[PDB]
Symmetry: C2
Subunit: 84 residues, 2 copies
């Protein structure tokens, strides 16, 4: 029951609030549970925003070297889980 | 006050899973509400890789490599500084 915010002012304020919320939660997860986290966000104007718990090059390099299988989710899977 | 010692190691996995899912849920919401493309890469303390992409990971990482520099770049040091203000 969630949809896309059409009004550009209400889109930007919501984007900023939630982008910061995401980074705050990523920070918390990283310190609480000893995780390494990277977050890449392209907004609707195609502006790039990024967060990395350590630094981005480190996390992306680890990502590209990972030999073991990935556990991977997309919007389709998240939306399915949320229905339950 | 050593931040990594805060958590009870007994509930480590459950806390990790709950918060990982919270992060993905919020990423999903942001992507639909604000028309964003989002990728999330998480290595847990046992070095298990978990990933989320709103579209798919190869698409988001390719967009990343075709951009020259971030508009905002943050790490834990910056987030912690902002939170103190």
């Amino acid at each position: 029951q969630i949809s896309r915010i059409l009004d550009q002012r209400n889109r930007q304020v919501t984007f900023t609030k939630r982008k910061f919320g995401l980074m705050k939660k990523a920070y918390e997860l990283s310190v609480l549970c000893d995780c390494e986290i990277a977050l890449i966000i392209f907004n609707s104007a195609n502006r790039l925003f990024q967060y990395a718990s350590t630094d981005m090059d480190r996390v992306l390099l680890k990502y590209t070297e990972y030999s073991e299988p990935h556990e991977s989710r997309t919007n389709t899977d998240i939306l399915e889980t949320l229905k339950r």
